[PDB]
Design a protein around this ligand. Sequence first.
Ligand SMILES: CCCCCCCCCCCCCCCCCC(=O)OC[C@H](COP(=O)(O)OCCN)OC(=O)CCCCCCCCCCCCCCCCC
Ligand SMILES: CCCCCCCCCCCC(=O)OC[C@H](COP(=O)(O)OCC[N+](C)(C)C)OC(=O)CCCCCCCCCCC
Ligand SMILES: CCCCCCCCCCCCO[C@H]1O[C@H](CO)[C@@H](O[C@H]2O[C@@H](CO)[C@H](O)[C@H](O)[C@@H]2O)[C@H](O)[C@H]1O
Lengths: 70, 86, 128, 61, 171, 469, 185, 68, 89, 78, 341
Amino acid sequence: ARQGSFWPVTFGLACCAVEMMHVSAPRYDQDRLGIIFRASPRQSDIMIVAGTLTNKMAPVLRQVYDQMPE
Amino acid sequence: AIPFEALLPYGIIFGLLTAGGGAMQVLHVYRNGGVRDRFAIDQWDSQMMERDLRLNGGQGRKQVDQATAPEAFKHNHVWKSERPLI
Amino acid sequence: MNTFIIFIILIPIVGFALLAVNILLAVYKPYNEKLGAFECGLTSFNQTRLAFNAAFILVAILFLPFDLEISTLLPYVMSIYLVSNYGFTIVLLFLLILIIGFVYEINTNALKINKHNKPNTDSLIYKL
Amino acid sequence: LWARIYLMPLLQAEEDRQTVRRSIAQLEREKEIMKGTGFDVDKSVYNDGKFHAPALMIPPK
Amino acid sequence: PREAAAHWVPFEDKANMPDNVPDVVEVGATSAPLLSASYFIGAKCKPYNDDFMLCREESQGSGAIDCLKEGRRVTRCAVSVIEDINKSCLDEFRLHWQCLEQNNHQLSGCRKAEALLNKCVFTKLNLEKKIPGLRPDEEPVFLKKDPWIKPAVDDFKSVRAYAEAKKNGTL
Amino acid sequence: MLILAIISLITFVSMSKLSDNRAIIRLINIYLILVLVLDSFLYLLFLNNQTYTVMGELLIFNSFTFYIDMLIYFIMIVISSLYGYNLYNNNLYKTLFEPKKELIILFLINILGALLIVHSNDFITLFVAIELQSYSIYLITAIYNSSYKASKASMLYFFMGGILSILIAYSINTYYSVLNSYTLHSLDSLIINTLDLNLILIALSLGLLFKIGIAPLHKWLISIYENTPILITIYISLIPKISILSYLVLSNISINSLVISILAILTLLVGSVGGLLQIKIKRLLAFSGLTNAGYMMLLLLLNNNEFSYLYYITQYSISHLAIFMIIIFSIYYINYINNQYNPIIYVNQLKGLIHDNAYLVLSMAIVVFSFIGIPPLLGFFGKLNILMSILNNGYYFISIVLIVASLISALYYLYLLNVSIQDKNNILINSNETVSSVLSYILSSLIILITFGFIYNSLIIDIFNVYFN
Amino acid sequence: MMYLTYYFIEITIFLAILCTIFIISAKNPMVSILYMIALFVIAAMYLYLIGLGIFSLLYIMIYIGAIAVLFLFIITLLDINSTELSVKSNIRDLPLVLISLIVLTISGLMIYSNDSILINKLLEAFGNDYNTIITQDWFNIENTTLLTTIGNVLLTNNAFILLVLAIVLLLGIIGPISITMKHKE
Amino acid sequence: TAAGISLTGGRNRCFSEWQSFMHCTAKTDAKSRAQCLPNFEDYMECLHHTKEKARLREIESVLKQKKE
Amino acid sequence: MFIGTIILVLSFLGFVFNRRNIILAFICLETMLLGINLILLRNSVLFDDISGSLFAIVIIILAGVESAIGLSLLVSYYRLRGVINSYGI
Amino acid sequence: MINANPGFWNGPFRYLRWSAHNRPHLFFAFAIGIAGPVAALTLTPLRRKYLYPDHSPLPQSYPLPQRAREQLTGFDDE
Amino acid sequence: MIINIVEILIFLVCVLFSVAYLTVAERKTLAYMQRRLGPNFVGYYGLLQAFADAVKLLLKEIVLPKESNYIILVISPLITLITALIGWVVIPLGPGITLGELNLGILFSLAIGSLGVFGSLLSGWSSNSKYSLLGSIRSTAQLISYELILTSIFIIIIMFVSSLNITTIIETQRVVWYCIPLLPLLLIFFIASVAETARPPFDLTESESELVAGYFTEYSGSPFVFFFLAEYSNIILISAFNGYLLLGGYLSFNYSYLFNILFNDYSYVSFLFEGLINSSAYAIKLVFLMFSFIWVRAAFPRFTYDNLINFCWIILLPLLFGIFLIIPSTLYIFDSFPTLI
Ligand SMILES: CCCCCCCCCCCCCCCCCC(=O)OC[C@H](COP(=O)(O)OCCN)OC(=O)CCCCCCCCCCCCCCCCC
Ligand SMILES: CCCCCCCCCCCC(=O)OC[C@H](COP(=O)(O)OCC[N+](C)(C)C)OC(=O)CCCCCCCCCCC
Ligand SMILES: CCCCCCCCCCCCO[C@H]1O[C@H](CO)[C@@H](O[C@H]2O[C@@H](CO)[C@H](O)[C@H](O)[C@@H]2O)[C@H](O)[C@H]1O
């Protein structure tokens, strides 16, 4: 169940988000494997840190991470 | 239609609701004794069904076509004694 | 014990099944910030309410009369044959009188949201 | 509706005969409940001379 | 009267009728055969039925006790009609009311048995079905050739019997 | 005509600006005048007191109700004139007295409820009409939503009227539980003397009466009349009273009640005493209305009360309109505008009005001495007819209380006149602005009616003896 | 098995007392509105019990569906401060509360009977002992229910009150616009 | 206006007594209106069942204390 | 008869002895109307009469309009004041 | 502005054209609502005259005859 | 009462599993519209995706934030789900084949649908957040505003059949389905259905709120599963309303000829085949309507709150207040006021 429902949080910060979106695109369909990107961390299980982490953004990253249910 | 993989869940929904309706038809008929259900019943039909229960031996919706009733029908009458409404 | 009664009681007194399954199976070890609420965000002891436009509450206040109108039409549609050509005229007068109020509602523009920061439409005139 | 009309008097005659039976049986029963008193059970609570079914009863138990 | 509410215990009465009231047989037919024989009862028991209702109305309250002779006549006339049906016209009658049972007691689902029964009773007992109140311009719905409203499934036995009767000229 | 007016004005006001509401009020005022002129020949239906039942048996039409309806039209004409015609064409009087867009529609709907109260023959009609009056008059109290006092009064009036409407509904449903009926025609001699029925009936009477300020439930309505605008007070202090008291007079519900006698004595004493220390004008006039409501409560114990009630309610309506109009006219000479809504509050602001306008003070004197009941004015004949009826029917202690209340009320009626005929420094010598012609004529006509209506009393009695007997 | 459903009117009376107490007692007025909804549910139950389920559903769709919704709508949008039920604030009411409870209940039960002596007027109200006989007639040929008859009388015998309720609903539209909206010009 | 109408659209439970009483009122004047006392008593008895309740109280009391 | 009188009386007392809210006042009015309607409908059933049910459905409509108007008036009061306090209506 | 209201009283036909072009949601609602009552007034008698008349009433209760009783026999006792 | 329990369990199983597979149907249909495929990996051909989602969610924490309320957050899903499921009691899959054969079935449906607004109302109260309390308000405004249109269409249909028995409303459509005389009302009822279900293009506050920190449904664990079940059950139930009001419910071609050919007397095979045909018709109509929901999600952009309220109150209700006048007039012109049953 944890594999076949694999819901990351929308934490795209930079140009790696382009590849994330292409993984949601027709050629590679993330939804075929059960993957749905969820806006709020309370509904999420994974955090894909896709982009540079600035010193102005790290507290936000840790808050988003701590808001995620185990 | 081309995408059968997309129609498989619709086929499951269709099959489940269809089989449910069929089994429910069969169970309703078993409950009634080989007769389709009654619906949209008013006061008149309820009172007539109770009368039928008086003329058959409590055998549900069994119908009788005889011209004279048993002599139990004279003493099988029911009046209903209702709680006081408050 | 009818199937209607069985269903309508069974749904409530069973609906907490997966609730209990989830409460017993799942982890629960909260943090402070897992009990938190957002990415950023704060508010001092300023107030308990925000200023709202009139239409937000007027839609709800006007739902009551129009809903009562449409629910008062139920006796007519269940009496339509017995009140033949008399109640028809009566309910038409009813609907017309209640359409007058709807006309008032439309012409006043009571459900419209108005904008404060208008765009300036006045000409540029230079005193010579 | 016309079928139900043509069937009304039959069924109402049945119900009337059963009404008469039970309304008279109840009086003959209350006579034997009220043996040794001057209580007139057949005295109607209505001042007209019309037939009135009981309209109320002691609960069975 | 209203239907019972919030609690109600049935209670019977094991007493017999008084002896100044003569005995009368009951009708003994259930819902469906009585619905099938309604019009033939009305064709024959019109005077007795309306006399029963007129003596009820004239009594002005005492109809249960003043109308017993009249109701006995009504019951006997109905029993005579159904005895004549059973003695003579039982197969078509049974077709009709079994057809009524598999429907919701809608006469619109039983016209093929109704035709045979009406023919039989009109020829043997001389009682015909007539819906009163109509004009000569209005078509009675039980004589319409192609109605809007038809049964979901027309009854099997009735269809076979209608076919055989059209092949043998009974209709 | 009222429903035609309502359905017309809703559209015409929706499709019109706020610059057109005054002219709309003028139009509908002329409409009501034409109605009262052309359609008033219907009095001939009620010759020899012929009574008609209309809408099944839901409405009743007789001479009493036709008269009350003509009176309510006359009142609405005056109150609409006060909104449709500017007193002075100044910026002040375009700031103080402006009609709001929906005010005329609410007035007409309240008039509709008033008349369906007086014409009611079944309690379902009475309740629907009571609610149509009370909801509309809540909204009339609230339409000037830029006033803190008016919003507060709106909400108090909503809740208290709601509770008293609960009482009316309980009374009605209990009457139905007992008799299985909603109609008072169902009552006769036999039913009254066979069933004890006075609790239900007096509960209905009190639920209707406390909605017009009958003591001990007077303070809330007096606060509402104080805290509302003057041109709203003039309406909400009069028309509900006419409606409800006319229903309770036509329906003979409290013919020899002890509770109504007690509460009427209490209303008289309170309405006379409590008005003695009032320094504000509207509270004084509210207590005046309270004691007049007591005088009219007294004739709910008579069983032959049509002439007295109609005379007294007509003269009280004329006097009420006249005194509020005089207070409205006095704002040009007061030296201190208190509010945008109540420009004049205190009685001492009328000090010296005789040196600025003397004939306005003559009008005030006429109205004050009609309130006191001084002959040959109209209030005297009102009080006389009331006394005639109550002494013919055996209320001898109430009569002495009535005299004592008539005397105690004169003090606070004379407070106004006394301060008005006092001397003032800084008098008026000239003013180029003139007050309206129409409103001046209306006030003068009311004053002339108060002064010279006694000439026609013989004729009025002769007409009454044909249409009401 | 028979009398398991006998006391279902008494249970509704008990639950209604409870829900009213909770309305008066709840800290947050949102909870008071929810208990009012529960009281409407209890009343709808009782109406089904005495044989008026049409009114139960009408209540569910009108009261709970619109009026309670509007209550929640306003308390979600307006600041309505509240003082909690306290002993330093409300205990003074107990003497008058009890006096009024006794007087009002006893008068409300006395008012329904026509007997002359006052004590007997309460004793008849508590005289709910004997059951009603429900006999069957065969005179009603149609399928007329309560809603059909309400429509019949309201559109024929009582058309005037319907065409007056129309103006009441017009007020329900025209008043709130006059009070809540501010017209530009 | 809706007087005498049932929940089913017809005559109510206590129609006949009311109609008898109203016939007797139509016959009578306010001075002869006391003739209609038994009719009104019948109407109210049909409504509220006071006398029948007292009767059954007597019957039950004889079933109650004269036996136990 | 009992449930309605009880709801009515308790709602009236919770209206009169309310030192807390305005929402409780609204609620107590609505519950009072409810209690009246329940007594009314019980009598409607016992008499087998339609006038009671007619009056009841009319009360439903009128109470809805009452609620709408009352909660418009509250909104005007709040337009000017901004807070609806424990006291002061 | 571009397509402002021309006023109904400054021309009905032009106003209605403008309404159909710029306010169809109101214009065609008006048409639907108006066409029912007017058709009910004007077309119903033509229907009664030339297509089919109104139906005869349904019984609604037992049709109690408006006569005096007649002596009968048949189906008596014995 | 044994077979009553059996019937209830069959009905529950079929309904809930239909919901769970409607989730997969949504995903796969939207995918193949978008020139992709998914889900196809978490069972054979994707037929265990919903159960994987459920099992995951039923093992996640039930975190409730600091300034939130425990009870409201936890029961609002459950109340919403109860109200969504008890509306299936009156839905017929045949002539009388129903759990609740109520003669007031339309009013039961229309009254239990009135209670779905409380979920969106109470969601806002489960935090000390002032902007979510306004998102609550906007959503509730949308729902109460389109309830009027659904009820109006209900009443316009009941003008043709003077009954609140759903089986009678269906059996009147043996002659013609009410989508033929009232084809625009089919569009209007579908639009108001999509708007009552808060589905795209009417997904304002869900879309609104995922942007902001709050104003949407930030539930985890079992509340979340219950909300999904409520959503995807109300979709099927509002499509059921479409069905039995306008599309004939369970009706199809007349199969009397075929049955007289295949059979000679009433057997249980006869009854089973009748039931299968009827519920097949009902189910294929439901499938089409669900596909239409998905199609509309795939095609169109989103509304704003102003455009939506304006749509409702200034375009749709005028038409329906006109239709209230035109339908009884059409019945009066031709002497066709319908009788009871
Ligand atoms: C509206 C808000 C919602 C709440 C509502 C609450 C329920 C409503 C209660 C009833 C309705 C309120 C009635 C208002 C009070 C005024 C009633 C009234 O004036 O009617 C009295 C009337 C007699 O007066 P009258 O007709 O004028 O004079 C002729 C006399 N032959 O008729 C009578 O003769 C009355 C009969 C006398 C019996 C009165 C019953 C009181 C019994 C209380 C006893 C309590 C026990 C002792 C004390 C306990 C304290 C610990
Ligand atoms: C009527 C408008 C009222 C508005 C206020 C103006 C007062 C008009 C008084 C006329 C009454 C009438 O002449 O009638 C006498 C009425 C009953 O007669 P009627 O059935 O109403 O027929 C009248 C037919 N009219 C309408 C065509 C005229 O008896 C009364 O108890 C009247 C008591 C009122 C006493 C107040 C006297 C005021 C002095 C009048 C100086 C001219
Ligand atoms: C109800 C059964 C009980 C178990 C609960 C099952 C929960 C599973 C619910 C899934 C239902 C489908 O719901 C889901 O659909 C698609 C899945 O691609 C998501 O959509 C997401 O994927 C992409 C597709 O590449 C979309 O473009 C969209 O932008 C979003 O990023 C929706 O945001 C979500 O709502």
